[PDB]
Amino acid sequence: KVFGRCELAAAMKRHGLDNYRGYSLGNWVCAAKFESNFNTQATNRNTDGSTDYGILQINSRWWCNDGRTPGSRNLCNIPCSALLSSDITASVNCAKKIVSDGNGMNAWVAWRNRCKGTDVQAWIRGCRL
Ligand SMILES: CC(=O)N[C@@H]1[C@@H](O)[C@H](O)[C@@H](CO)O[C@@H]1O
Ligand SMILES: [Cl-]
Ligand SMILES: [Cl-]
Ligand SMILES: [Cl-]
Ligand SMILES: [Cl-]
Ligand code: NA
């Protein structure tokens, strides 16, 4: 599923992402825009053999199990395919664990390079919420 910008903002807010760990909703919408272009089915292979999954491009190196990243962790205790569902519940719950691990949203390379320090509120402008 490819979300609309305001559709995704609503779903993230319903699942309690808005200001989670101090990150306003626009931060999460911006991150998903640049990690996946709002596509819950996005996947990308990393150079070390791991893979990033779903609308927030969560990495199998640490967070999910895909059966093909030897030596990795599954800290969210989910199959990576659960991060590709049209329902973002699993991605949100895993993102809450990631952002709580001490580094905040710097765990998302696209947020760090393309959202951090910008006017992220622009990403929820015009949505009802
Ligand atoms: C929280 C998380 O899994 N972030 C990943 C990061 O691990 C990876 O290096 C990158 C590759 O483009 O995509 C995502 O930002
Ligand atoms: Cl915001
Ligand atoms: Cl594995
Ligand atoms: Cl949803
Ligand atoms: Cl922080
Ligand atoms: Na893993």
Side-chain angles (χ1 to χ4, degrees), residues 1 3 40-41 81-88 91:
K1 169 177 178 172
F3 273 82
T40 68
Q41 298 189 265
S81 65
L83 299 171
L84 303 178
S85 171
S86 50
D87 186 332
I88 66 169
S91 288

Side-chain angles (χ1 to χ4, degrees), residues 22-54:
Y23 290 93
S24 70
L25 192 51
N27 280 282
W28 298 100
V29 174
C30 182
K33 169 65 180 190
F34 291 122
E35 289 288 1
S36 65
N37 200 22
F38 297 147
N39 181 2
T40 68
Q41 298 189 265
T43 66
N44 283 277
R45 172 73 29 81
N46 300 310
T47 68
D48 62 13
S50 60
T51 305
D52 320 296
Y53 293 87

Side-chain angles (χ1 to χ4, degrees), residues 44 55-56 88 116-117 121 124:
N44 283 277
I55 203 154
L56 288 170
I88 66 169
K116 184 178 185 175
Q121 189 272 326
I124 61 171

Side-chain angles (χ1 to χ4, degrees), residues 2-117:
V2 174
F3 273 82
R5 168 181 72 93
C6 293
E7 178 185 31
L8 179 66
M12 283 175 164
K13 178 161 201 183
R14 171 170 50 104
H15 286 106
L17 257 196
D18 52 303
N19 222 46
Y20 193 86
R21 288 281 164 176
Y23 290 93
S24 70
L25 192 51
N27 280 282
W28 298 100
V29 174
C30 182
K33 169 65 180 190
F34 291 122
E35 289 288 1
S36 65
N37 200 22
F38 297 147
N39 181 2
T40 68
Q41 298 189 265
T43 66
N44 283 277
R45 172 73 29 81
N46 300 310
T47 68
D48 62 13
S50 60
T51 305
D52 320 296
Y53 293 87
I55 203 154
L56 288 170
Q57 286 293 280
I58 287 172
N59 197 343
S60 63
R61 174 60 56 191
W62 301 103
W63 305 113
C64 63
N65 175 61
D66 65 8
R68 55 149 283 137
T69 313
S72 64
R73 316 286 299 268
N74 178 13
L75 290 180
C76 292
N77 281 145
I78 42 158
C80 298
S81 65
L83 299 171
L84 303 178
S85 171
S86 50
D87 186 332
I88 66 169
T89 298
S91 288
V92 167
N93 284 335
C94 190
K96 284 178 186 175
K97 187 180 223 327
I98 296 166
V99 72
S100 303
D101 74 359
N103 295 100
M105 283 194 78
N106 293 296
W108 286 277
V109 179
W111 176 87
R112 205 173 64 238
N113 291 331
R114 305 178 76 174
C115 305
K116 184 178 185 175

